Symmetry: C3
Subunit: 529 residues, 3 copies
């Protein structure tokens, strides 16, 4: 869209010669939208003379002169603008390394010998080391049959749990028990061969590039009106972005400036301060990657049932010998990954996997240019770039292509396309997949809107689509759909509208979806009454 | 405010017929402010002919023809714009269910029998179940008199604490103690009848609707100058918003586009990733609702003194029998709610209640259109919407109403209006309540500014107010006021200015407030010296 | 940059007299950039008459009249705009007080007497109090030689750790051990004399002030063209900002409006909800200040190895007597500060110190106007302010100064300038320090860009610099530089470009830097195999 278009006398005072150079320019301010991938509209700046060196018309030299390229002839300077896919890239800062799944190994020594002392040189589990220095509390812990447990197991069965499932019965091995050598167990902390590096994510940065194609005419162009045959011209592509928000033509006929983007209506996911878990090595494979909130972790390794739970946490756990094997070792990377695989299967969105933003596919993040240790997300909310073009021309006009369209498909699917037709209310979300077609002979821009929805359907923001002539396109990633009630519904409705480049509806369709009632965490029953 | 206003030749190349249709349009870009609730200003687009089908003037048909509605007559196309209240709505995703207040029930069996075994079929507290399966560690724990405690209580008094306050004295019941049946206690975990559903909040989305009222003239209008009598016209309201950022007139004389909003000077509260606690059922009542940081919770129920503390945390607590009743069960939803009620009474802002954003009132969130399971907040920071109007007219002019105003009241009050006159420095904030009056005969826009403040008073952002003719208005929600020093002050000052629609001060007033010194957490005294 | 420039008929309907006052104005919308500190460009509004009271030309009174100041003469109204340094200020809300370093004092009483009872009136460590009330669990804990430990230490050496390093050997003191008086120890929790106040940070607010200098002419001004000698004029400075986004001239020839800023390409650090640790007292000294994530803290004091770990956490720690002295007391403010000093020395960025945002210097935050209890950060991402000027003039022109420049230095340094030449890949970041010079006779604006970088170098956003004539300037704070691979590289490259005010490169330079391989946390080796 064109914000402003008009004439301005722009003067420049030279820094070294103090001389003032004034020239009237056509100043255009326009927006370069998020999904503006095709050259579907152009700005035609009218020039009163061609091949002007200084940009000033009329010609100061004679056409009879072979060294005078300037011709007092009219032709338009055609300027089109596109934007590359927009990404929110988060800088990584390495914190620590985390094991996939620390595992407890239980030893039941035949000789009934168990050594877990802090000053023990030869313990049952052995010691761990770090650069030749012995790691504190890495020797594990020992457990033995309680005198009460031996009594209960001999004359019946002990109701108290033993971590290693020891048989405390006197008759299980009476010779050793009699002389004090009661059944014993060793509890060693071992690590999975797979380790993960943890990187804290910084603040998002919008990353894109705007390409301005400038067709500079060298000669003029050779009841229903049609577009004039193109003038012999010289193409030139200029690039703008947050890194380089400035650019000028070689002729310096055109000068562009990236002012900045307007604010996004839907904020970016709050993932700064989270810890990105990347697999340690034995194109970038972000499939196994996870992004975890700091509450899910134990940085110092001193806390149980957390990502990073270490030797001290495991060794000194309250009533450790009376707990079940692998207690203290829940909520590890392997557990969380598996809990998420379970969630996807239940039509729910993962909490830890990095695909919880894309909507299922790992393939969408792959198209990102960043290095092996980079993380970014596709931006779907509109982020309108204000660009200001300053041209040495008489005037300007806007020439927009308007091809009609048709919605060829629309469905509400679950995460990772588990099933289409609807999703679980409030405990899950749906994904609006839409297939559209350009039914014209020209590349054109379109707007997909979801509105006039049934009760308690969260508003969905619109989507921009640049579709090639006669070609088919789809929304990637799809639109997120949430309901604001926990009830089961057979046919919740929404109108899916397809607007052309001029703001007229070319196609409309009613999208129907079901919701399954929210499956709340089931309350425990019983206890003291 | 009007950013740009000028003429642009806009051409459209038809997608199927390839024919070019050019027409010069008046292009206006303007801002639609946050508190723009009334039609206080209009854009008058001058038309050289009325009832034109194609929007093109002059008339291509004869006035003598009954099927020709077009008249070569002048009249303005009046266009006014308003914005509905702006909301930041956060999508809910169900995580788990949390009890209001888990309660410990202490049993002191007469028969001195206590069973807390892991494999015990009939324990003292009984078992809890989930879908017929027995819940692990839900049988509670048992405590008994230490042999040392029986000795101390017999020959004096035990200085060691017992959880159930057992009388370990031999003479309390000598017959049972003699035969080994020492006093015993059972500690059962029970749950309050009230449960709460926990929903993780997603990213904010700005939600509003812009209404453009278009008065299309059908006939012309029938030293101090006055406004011309209105021309016989046909009203039409068009709507723009993040969902539908496009709109055109039925006549397609006017075409609107929502470009997006500028960034807000004061960021939205960082409440994404927090867990919204909604009461489980036995208009939407968000009064009892709470919003909690993940650090306040124990999702897996394995950690003590957290929202979600469960059976394992309670059963295996270090020196559990030597702690006070209800240990491990602090910091529950009931405790936090009560700690917040306490805070409000002390002139402090709640940390967990969802009213900690509004400034006291539960009534402000009630005016939100969302479903029973929706959460949103009123936006008070300016969020300026850029709208671009493209009209088939000769020119345009802006007609703004300028009614004078007066500040009829201004006070600094505490949270939930506890008391007015001031607040506690740094540990609390104040709320600037302002009452203004339109002292003119026309609906008008105003700006309330708080500036020229005394030392260490945090800058307050301005506020837009559209007030009806002769009517009274107030700031809702009020302005937040913070000080940057911890000292007690009798009369800290600020200038409250009321600007008219033209940028001239109609009323000014000096607002005075006190601050009570920051009441810091009192340090413990004593211990080893 | 100038967005729009054109004429608009602006009408005002008086609220009390209902009379319409129309006047055609020149409406200019422009951007006021982040580093726009100097008056390097001006807008010249052409006036057809001078000293007009109503702003309307031509003169309604005779020049022959002594009480008629109006002269039908031409002169420009010169308007320049600057912006003060931009800050993101976070409101403080006091939560609690935290000790610098709680310390454990170990007592080994000669008389072998240790009292740690909950109902004990005279315990070994003594009690702590709060307003005369005894603080629960503040009496510490007692430890004694295990009967097994006495046996092992007598007939060899005990392999089990004792917290106070007790000699459990019978022969160490046989008289007392024989009669049951085994070696005992007391473990008292003491506090460092230094305490810190913890303040929760609220949401960021952009804070700046735009100064518009208006030179109102009173009389007219007295082949290579030069700038006309200045017209006798009267200077006037107007101020805009989030608090007061409105302003008008005394002549009301000029009327300004702050529309708002465009969104920043690089989001502000996610520091809301974090706890700012300010030293308690015995210009503002923010050197010792720290900003901590809530996961680093124990608000209720019930959890070990956290900022806020208190008496209960310390008293009831699992196997407390078998742990090393000061266990439970790790991760305190003193520890974190020291771990950060260690990080800076290793070329790494601190995690807790508030200098982790500036890039090393404490001096950058000092230039902030806020009170003793205020926190703010310098904004380096562009934040473009849209300003709309509405002037009673015939037309306008833009006069920009263009002085050439040169890059006099460029280096990649570590945090706090540890060493220049490069940094540690992914585990650290580099800081691009750039020194530029204005080689002209006029104050001018410039753009520093970092682009055409070697593989896996994170894109750096551009930087605006207003440099005085003939003067030297540098980027403060410096540019952050991250790599997207963990490899060691000798010469990673980037082009540092210096653009003049017109968008032409005046100087270019290639910046070379090394990266040291990411030093990952070393995995423990050993344990059970
Ligand atoms: C989520 O809900 C879907 C639909 O919602 C509910 O539909 C009814 C079952 C009814 O209870 C209504 O009030 C709800 O709104 C569930 O999908 C339905 O699944 C049915 C069983 O699989 C299916 O049925 C018939 O299926 C075929 C014909 O299609 C027959 O061969 C068969 O014998 C059944 O009669 C029904 O058509 C289907 N409905 C839709 C709209 O797809 C869905 O299973 C549920 N999800 C989960 C995981 O529970
Ligand atoms: C917060 O501070 C308020 C005012 O600040 C302080 O005012 C003085 C007490 C003095 O110490 C000064 O240096 C401070 O700035 C407190 O309000 C004050 O409360 C007083 C006692 O209630 C009150 O007094 C008189 O009140 C009436 C007359 O108004 C008499 O009948 C009575 O006998 C007292 O003489 C005083 O007027 C009032 N001041 C104001 C400005 O309202 C406020 O209590 C305090 N809040 C808390 C919770 O401590
Ligand atoms: C981070 O890396 C810097 C450079 O990277 C590496 O340089 C080589 C050592 C080589 O391994 C290459 O593949 C890497 O890219 C380290 O800086 C280097 O440090 C060397 C030893 O201090 C130094 O060498 C010579 O230094 C002087 C001459 O300058 C001689 O007197 C001396 O005898 C050595 O021969 C080398 O020049 C220097 N390189 C650069 C580019 O500065 C840096 O130490 C390292 N940082 C850490 C903390 O490990
Ligand atoms: C959008 O169009 C694609 C086809 O271009 C649809 O995908 C096909 O779906 C059928 C039936 O499930 C499969 O047999 C094909 O293998 C699919 N092709 C591809 C390339 O995936 C898709 O379902 C359409 N989406 C909507 C919402 O209508
Ligand atoms: C703004 O005006 C309202 C009245 O319209 C004031 O509220 C009244 O205050 C008096 C005195 O406390 C009460 O008796 C009334 O019941 C209140 N009315 C309502 C509707 O609340 C209010 O105090 C004024 N605010 C300021 C800051 O001056
Ligand atoms: C930018 O210029 C300053 C000088 O104005 C440089 O700083 C000096 O560096 C030398 C050598 O290290 C020291 O002897 C001086 O004491 C420094 N002066 C000051 C004021 O710090 C600085 O190194 C230059 N930076 C770059 C990147 O070239
Ligand atoms: C990514 O990594 C996993 C690791 O198990 C592997 O199975 C997969 O094939 C890899 N490649 C892709 C493209 O997913
Ligand atoms: C209202 O919604 C229904 C579908 O629910 C649709 O048929 C209709 O066209 C919509 N009307 C408007 C005015 O949006
Ligand atoms: C909201 O819920 C509470 C629950 O106790 C009830 O007391 C109250 O009356 C309800 N209604 C309103 C409007 O607050
Ligand atoms: C300065 O502040 C005082 C009130 O503290 C006010 O009376 C005065 O009008 C203000 N002046 C300006 C120029 O803002
Ligand atoms: C700030 O505080 C520290 C406290 O130890 C002190 O050493 C320092 O000199 C103070 N001043 C400055 C300007 O750093
Ligand atoms: C490409 O980068 C190199 C430095 O790496 C530089 O010399 C060259 O000028 C750059 N070219 C462009 C077109 O940016």
């Amino acid at each position: 869209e064109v914000i402003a278009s008009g004439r301005l006398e722009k003067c420049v005072v030279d820094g070294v010669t103090e001389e003032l150079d004034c020239q009237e320019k056509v100043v255009v301010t326009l927006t370069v939208g998020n999904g503006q991938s095709l050259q579907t509209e152009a700005l035609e700046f009218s020039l009163s003379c061609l091949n002007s060196p200084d940009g000033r018309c009329p010609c100061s030299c004679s056409a009879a002169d072979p060294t005078c390229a300037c011709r007092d002839l009219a032709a338009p300077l055609r300027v089109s603008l596109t934007k590359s896919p927009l990404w929110a890239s988060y800088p990584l800062q390495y914190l620590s390394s985390f094991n996939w799944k620390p595992l407890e190994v239980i030893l039941r020594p035949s000789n009934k010998v168990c050594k877990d002392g802090d000053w023990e040189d030869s313990p049952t589990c052995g010691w761990f080391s770090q650069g030749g220095v012995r790691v504190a509390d890495s020797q594990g812990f020992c457990c033995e049959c309680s005198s009460s447990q031996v009594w209960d197991d001999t004359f019946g069965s002990s109701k108290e749990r033993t971590r290693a499932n020891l048989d405390c019965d006197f008759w299980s091995d009476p010779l050793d028990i009699l002389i004090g050598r009661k059944p014993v167990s060793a509890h060693c902390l071992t690590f999975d061969p797979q380790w993960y590096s943890g990187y804290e994510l910084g603040a998002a940065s919008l990353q894109f590039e705007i390409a301005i194609t400038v067709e500079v005419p060298t000669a003029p162009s050779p009841a229903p009106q049609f577009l004039s045959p193109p003038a012999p011209s010289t193409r030139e592509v200029l690039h703008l972005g947050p890194s380089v928000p400035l650019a000028s033509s070689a002729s310096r006929l055109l000068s562009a400036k990236l002012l900045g983007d307007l604010a996004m209506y839907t904020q970016l996911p709050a993932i700064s301060n989270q810890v990105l878990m990347v697999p340690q090595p034995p194109a970038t494979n972000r499939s196994a990657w996870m992004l975890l909130d700091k509450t899910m972790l134990s940085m110092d390794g001193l806390a149980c049932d957390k990502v990073g739970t270490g030797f001290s946490a495991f060794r000194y756990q309250p009533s450790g010998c009376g707990r079940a094997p692998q207690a203290c070792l829940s909520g590890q990377l392997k557990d969380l990954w598996e809990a998420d695989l379970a969630r996807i299967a239940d039509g729910r969105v993962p909490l830890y996997m990095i695909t919880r933003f894309t909507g299922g596919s790992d393939t969408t993040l792959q198209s990102f240019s960043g290095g092996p240790l980079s993380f970014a997300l596709p931006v779907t909310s509109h982020s309108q770039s204000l660009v200001t073009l300053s041209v040495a021309a008489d005037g300007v006009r806007l020439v927009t292509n308007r091809s009609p369209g048709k919605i060829t498909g629309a469905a509400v699917c679950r995460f990772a396309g588990t099933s289409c037709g609807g999703f679980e209310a409030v405990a899950a979300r749906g994904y609006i997949y839409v297939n559209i077609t350009n039914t014209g002979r020209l590349d054109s821009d379109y707007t997909l809107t979801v509105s006039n929805c049934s009760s308690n359907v969260r508003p969905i923001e619109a989507r921009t689509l640049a579709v090639r002539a006669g070609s088919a396109a789809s929304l990637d990633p799809p639109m997120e759909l949430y309901v604001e009630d926990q009830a089961a519904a057979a046919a919740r409705t929404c109108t899916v509208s397809l607007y052309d480049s001029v703001g007229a509806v070319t196609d409309s369709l009613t999208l129907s979806f079901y919701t399954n009632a929210t499956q709340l965490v089931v309350k425990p029953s019983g206890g003291y009454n």
